[PDB]
């Protein structure tokens, strides 16, 4: 009880597969535009790579490692090792090993900075380690 069209014009493919309520309307227009539309869902599976590139602006998907990268900036959602980079400030996120590397750190709050533990705490330093009230 549906209807189906498949065109070709000066502008490009205007392809739809439509019931009254639903449909799936894809184009390839000549103006450098690609569009796809649906009324429930889009799925797309592969086996090695799902890569999108606009002048070193990636989203890649391997079996294990998700890179979300541009120049100087790359979240690496690797297996068990989240790496979040701006040179030079790493934040490793592991099972039991969080580093927050940087050169400088500034931290603000307004109500609490609750810093608890279940074993010892060591704050090693140099020239100053100050406080106020």
């Amino acid at each position: 009880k549906a209807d189906h069209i498949f065109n070709l014009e000066e502008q490009g493919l205007l392809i739809d597969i439509k019931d009254d309520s639903k449909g799936c309307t894809t184009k390839l227009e000549s103006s450098g535009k690609i569009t796809h539309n649906a009324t429930e869902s889009i799925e797309s599976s592969a086996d090695k790579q799902i890569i999108e590139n606009v002048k070193d602006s990636k989203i890649s998907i391997t079996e294990k490692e998700i890179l979300l990268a541009t120049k100087k900036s790359s979240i690496m959602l690797s297996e068990d090792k989240i790496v979040i980079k701006i040179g030079n400030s790493l934040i490793i996120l592991d099972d039991s090993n969080i580093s927050l590397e940087s050169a400088t750190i500034n931290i603000k709050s307004s109500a609490n900075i609750n810093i608890q533990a279940s074993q010892n705490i060591d704050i090693k330093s140099l020239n100053n380690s100050i406080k106020a009230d």
Binding site: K1, A2, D3, H4, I5, F6, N7, L8, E9
Partner: peptide
């Protein structure tokens, strides 16, 4: 318009 391909009901 040009090349069409349709299914209807």
């Amino acid at each position: 318009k040009g090349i069409f391909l349709r299914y209807k009901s």
